[PDB]
Design an enzyme around this catalytic site. Sequence first.
Site, PDB file in Angstrom:
ATOM      1  N   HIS B  42     -42.594 -12.882  10.394  1.00  0.00           N
ATOM      2  CA  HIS B  42     -41.210 -13.251   9.881  1.00  0.00           C
ATOM      3  C   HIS B  42     -40.844 -14.360   8.933  1.00  0.00           C
ATOM      4  O   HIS B  42     -39.909 -14.027   8.443  1.00  0.00           O
ATOM      5  CB  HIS B  42     -40.192 -13.461  11.191  1.00  0.00           C
ATOM      6  CG  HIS B  42     -40.219 -14.918  11.647  1.00  0.00           C
ATOM      7  ND1 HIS B  42     -40.962 -15.430  12.687  1.00  0.00           N
ATOM      8  CD2 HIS B  42     -39.764 -15.996  11.128  1.00  0.00           C
ATOM      9  CE1 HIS B  42     -40.826 -16.392  13.009  1.00  0.00           C
ATOM     10  NE2 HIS B  42     -40.037 -17.104  11.970  1.00  0.00           N
ATOM     11  N   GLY B 144     -38.046 -24.691  11.737  1.00  0.00           N
ATOM     12  CA  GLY B 144     -39.510 -24.834  10.715  1.00  0.00           C
ATOM     13  C   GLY B 144     -40.602 -24.956  11.542  1.00  0.00           C
ATOM     14  O   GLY B 144     -41.633 -25.189  10.932  1.00  0.00           O
ATOM     15  N   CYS B 146     -42.249 -22.795  13.509  1.00  0.00           N
ATOM     16  CA  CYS B 146     -42.819 -21.476  13.835  1.00  0.00           C
ATOM     17  C   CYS B 146     -44.131 -21.821  13.083  1.00  0.00           C
ATOM     18  O   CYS B 146     -44.431 -22.208  11.898  1.00  0.00           O
ATOM     19  CB  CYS B 146     -42.308 -20.373  13.129  1.00  0.00           C
ATOM     20  SG  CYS B 146     -40.891 -19.937  14.527  1.00  0.00           S
TER      21      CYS B 146
HETATM   22  C1  LIG Z   1     -39.275 -20.257  13.130  1.00  0.00           C
HETATM   23  O1  LIG Z   1     -39.579 -21.764  12.628  1.00  0.00           O
HETATM   24  C2  LIG Z   1     -38.152 -20.459  14.276  1.00  0.00           C
HETATM   25  C3  LIG Z   1     -38.345 -21.474  15.479  1.00  0.00           C
HETATM   26  C4  LIG Z   1     -37.031 -21.690  15.970  1.00  0.00           C
HETATM   27  C5  LIG Z   1     -35.871 -22.179  15.574  1.00  0.00           C
HETATM   28  C6  LIG Z   1     -34.971 -22.894  16.643  1.00  0.00           C
HETATM   29  N1  LIG Z   1     -35.966 -23.255  17.487  1.00  0.00           N
HETATM   30  C7  LIG Z   1     -37.267 -22.765  17.370  1.00  0.00           C
HETATM   31  O2  LIG Z   1     -38.323 -22.875  18.193  1.00  0.00           O
HETATM   32  N2  LIG Z   1     -38.033 -19.340  14.736  1.00  0.00           N
HETATM   33  C8  LIG Z   1     -36.777 -18.389  14.248  1.00  0.00           C
HETATM   34  O3  LIG Z   1     -36.186 -18.853  13.366  1.00  0.00           O
HETATM   35  C9  LIG Z   1     -36.601 -17.080  15.001  1.00  0.00           C
HETATM   36  C10 LIG Z   1     -36.704 -15.983  13.943  1.00  0.00           C
HETATM   37  C11 LIG Z   1     -36.724 -14.522  14.688  1.00  0.00           C
HETATM   38  C12 LIG Z   1     -37.759 -14.378  15.729  1.00  0.00           C
HETATM   39  C13 LIG Z   1     -36.642 -13.389  13.567  1.00  0.00           C
HETATM   40  N3  LIG Z   1     -35.343 -16.996  15.486  1.00  0.00           N
HETATM   41  C14 LIG Z   1     -35.084 -18.038  16.677  1.00  0.00           C
HETATM   42  O4  LIG Z   1     -35.899 -18.900  17.238  1.00  0.00           O
HETATM   43  O5  LIG Z   1     -33.679 -17.877  16.977  1.00  0.00           O
HETATM   44  C15 LIG Z   1     -33.476 -18.976  17.941  1.00  0.00           C
HETATM   45  C16 LIG Z   1     -31.601 -19.062  17.911  1.00  0.00           C
HETATM   46  C17 LIG Z   1     -31.096 -20.362  18.535  1.00  0.00           C
HETATM   47  C18 LIG Z   1     -31.167 -20.255  19.810  1.00  0.00           C
HETATM   48  C19 LIG Z   1     -30.825 -18.789  20.165  1.00  0.00           C
HETATM   49  O6  LIG Z   1     -30.265 -18.101  21.177  1.00  0.00           O
HETATM   50  N4  LIG Z   1     -31.413 -17.946  18.982  1.00  0.00           N
HETATM   51  C20 LIG Z   1     -31.258 -16.708  18.608  1.00  0.00           C
HETATM   52  C21 LIG Z   1     -30.083 -16.027  18.164  1.00  0.00           C
HETATM   53  C22 LIG Z   1     -30.100 -14.544  17.915  1.00  0.00           C
HETATM   54  C23 LIG Z   1     -28.723 -14.059  17.967  1.00  0.00           C
HETATM   55  C24 LIG Z   1     -27.836 -14.926  16.943  1.00  0.00           C
HETATM   56  C25 LIG Z   1     -27.688 -16.399  17.656  1.00  0.00           C
HETATM   57  C26 LIG Z   1     -28.822 -16.389  18.792  1.00  0.00           C
HETATM   58  C27 LIG Z   1     -28.231 -14.898  19.312  1.00  0.00           C
END
Ligand SMILES: *[C@H](O)[C@H](C[C@@H]1CCNC1=O)NC(=O)[C@H](CC(C)C)NC(=O)OC[C@@H]1CCC(=O)N1C[C@H]1C[C@@H]2CC[C@H]1C2
Lengths: 300, 303
Positions: B42, B144, B146
Site C-alpha cells: 500500500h 507511519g 507500517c
Molecule cells: C501504515 O503505517 C498504517 C498503520 C496504522 C495507522 C494507524 N495505526 C496503524 O497501525 N496503516 C494504514 O494507514 C492502513 C492503510 C490501508 C490498509 C490501505 N489503514 C489503517 O490502518 O487504517 C486505520 C484507521 C484508523 C482506525 C480505523 O478504523 N481505521 C480504518 C478506517 C477505514 C474507514 C475510514 C475510517 C476508518 C474506517
Amino acid sequence: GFRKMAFPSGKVEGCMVQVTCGTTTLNGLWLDDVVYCPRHVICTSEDMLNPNYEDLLIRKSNHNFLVQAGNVQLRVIGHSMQNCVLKLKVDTANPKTPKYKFVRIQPGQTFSVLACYNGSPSGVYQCAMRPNFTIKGSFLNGSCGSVGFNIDYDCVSFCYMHHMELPTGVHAGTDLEGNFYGPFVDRQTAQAAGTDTTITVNVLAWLYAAVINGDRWFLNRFTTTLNDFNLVAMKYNYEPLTQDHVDILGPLSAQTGIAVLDMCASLKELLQNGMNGRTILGSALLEDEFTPFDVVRQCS
Amino acid sequence: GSGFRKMAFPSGKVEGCMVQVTCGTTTLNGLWLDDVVYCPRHVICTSEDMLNPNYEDLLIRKSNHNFLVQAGNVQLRVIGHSMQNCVLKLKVDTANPKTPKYKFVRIQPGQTFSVLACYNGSPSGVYQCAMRPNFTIKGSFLNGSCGSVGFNIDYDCVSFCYMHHMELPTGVHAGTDLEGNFYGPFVDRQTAQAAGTDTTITVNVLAWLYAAVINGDRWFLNRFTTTLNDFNLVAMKYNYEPLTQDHVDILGPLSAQTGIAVLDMCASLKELLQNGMNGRTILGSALLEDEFTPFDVVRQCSG
Ligand SMILES: *[C@H](O)[C@H](C[C@@H]1CCNC1=O)NC(=O)[C@H](CC(C)C)NC(=O)OC[C@@H]1CCC(=O)N1C[C@H]1C[C@@H]2CC[C@H]1C2
Ligand SMILES: *[C@H](O)[C@H](C[C@@H]1CCNC1=O)NC(=O)[C@H](CC(C)C)NC(=O)OC[C@@H]1CCC(=O)N1C[C@H]1C[C@@H]2CC[C@H]1C2
C-alpha cells in the site's frame, strides 16, 4: 494499545562481551578500550562470604582475566577497580561504541535491561528503579554484568549493571560508577530490602494512558487536594505526589482534559474500593512502571 | 509479581535491516535483506486509492525510479520491483552488509514474537506480542508504523514472521507474513473490517500452569485425566481455543520437566474452568495468563 516497550537494544548489543576469571564467567560492557564488569568475578566460593576486594584484586594479574568478544579474545593490558565495578583495559577499541554517558537514576525512573549470558544478549525488557532501590527483573545465573539503559537521540545513557538476586526474587545492582542502588553489598549473603512502595506518579501516568485508549470506567466527578490525596497515598504505601509530579503530568492532563487532582480522586477511589473485578489496560492491578515520559513517548 | 514478564528478543539484528520506502509523500518502513527490500504494497497508494485499490494497475503505472528507498539519509537505488501477495519486493543495487542469517516463517495463533516498532526507518521500541486466535495482535502502532516487523531469534537466525499493515476499528492490529499473506481474513484496503470474536489461548494457559508447577504452586493438580476431544468440547464452552496436535507436542518439554502428562494438566484446567479458582491464586494472580508460550516459559524458568 499500550504495553511495556523497551528501547531498541542494538547499540548496547555491540558492546557486550564475556569475562572469565577462574571458574566464574559473567558479562562485561566494552566501550572504547575498556571493559566494565562486576568485581565479584574475582571471588571464589571461599572469598564470596566476606571478600576483601582490594586484597583479592592486587593478587590478580592481567592474564587472569579472559575477555571474549564473540570468537575473539581481547588482551587485557591493565585493570582497576571503581567501587563495585572492575575496569579492564584492553588493547583494542570497540568500533561499535555508541555515543554514551553514565547516569545514576532516581527511584521511579524506568530503563531497558539487556539480559545477557556468556556475553551473548538474550532478552530486552523495561524495568523501574523501585523506591526501595531494587528492580523486579528477570535474571538467572550468569546474568551479572547485564546493563540497563535509556536512549535519547543517538546517545545511550547507561544506568544499571546487574550484580545479585535477593531471597524475595527481586534484583540489585550498581550504576556504572559501581555504586549500589540501595543498601546492598556484593557479598554472598541473603539480603533483604526496605519496604517497597508504589510509584504514585507512574500509576497516574498509566491511568491517563488508559483514558487515552478509551478505558474510563474508573473516572469520577470528584476532586481532592494534593495533601488529602497524599495522606491516603501514604496510608496505602504509595509514594507522595509532589508539585513537580503534578507539573510533569501536565501534558497528559491537557491531552485528556482531566486535571491531575481529578485523576488523584479516581486513584483514591481505586485504593479504597478496589477494582471491583474490572481491569485497566488488561491488568487486574495498578501498574506503576510507566513514567509520564514513557506514556507520552509511546502515545505520540 | 509472578516472576514472569514479557521479554523481547534483542533487536539489533533487525535494526540493521530497517529502511524507509517512500512513494510520493507516503513513507513507510521496509526490510532490507541481501539485495531485496520488502514492504507493504500500500506504499503505492494515494489517499484516494486506499478504499478500493487496484494494486495490479497501480503497480503497472510505477517504475523503479518512483521508489525512494533510504537507509537513514542514504538513498538505495532500486533496480527492479515486483509484488508478492500484499508485499512489494524492491530489488536494490547493494546487498545489505548487516543481513543476518534469516528465514521467513508463518506462525500459528498463540505464538509470540518481538515487534520492532519503527517510524521513517528508525526504530522506536521493541516489545513482545502474541498472535491471537482471531489473527490480530495487540500492538502499539501509530501512523507511519507500517512495514515494522515481528520476529523470533533462534541461535544465529532471525525468523521473520510479521509485517505490519493496518489497525482495525477495535484498536487491534493486522498484517502479513513476509510472503505477503495476511494472517486472518483481512485485506489491505481502507474499509471497515471486523476481527472475529477472540478466544483464550489454551496452549499458553497450559504453559502457565506448568510454569506454576515448576515454581512449586501446584494446588490445582488433580488425580484425573481427560481425552483431548472431551477437553476441547468443554474448552469451547468457556471461550477457550481447542487444542491441536501441534499444541500437545509443544507442551512436551514442560510435561517432561514436570512429569505431568499433557492430558492430566488438561483435566486440571477443565476443573478450574468449571469450578473457578474459589478465592485462590496461581503465581500470585486470580487470572490465568495466555500470552506466554511453552517456549517463553522454559526461557524464563530455565534459561
Ligand atoms: C501504515 O503505517 C498504517 C498503520 C496504522 C495507522 C494507524 N495505526 C496503524 O497501525 N496503516 C494504514 O494507514 C492502513 C492503510 C490501508 C490498509 C490501505 N489503514 C489503517 O490502518 O487504517 C486505520 C484507521 C484508523 C482506525 C480505523 O478504523 N481505521 C480504518 C478506517 C477505514 C474507514 C475510514 C475510517 C476508518 C474506517
Ligand atoms: C551474577 O551472574 C549473579 C546473578 C544472580 C544469580 C541468580 N540470579 C541473579 O540475579 N550474582 C550472584 O551470584 C551474586 C554474587 C554475590 C553478590 C557475590 N549472589 C547472588 O545473587 O546470590 C543470589 C542467591 C539466590 C537468592 C539469595 O538470597 N541468594 C544468596 C545466597 C547466599 C546465601 C546462600 C544461598 C543464598 C543465601
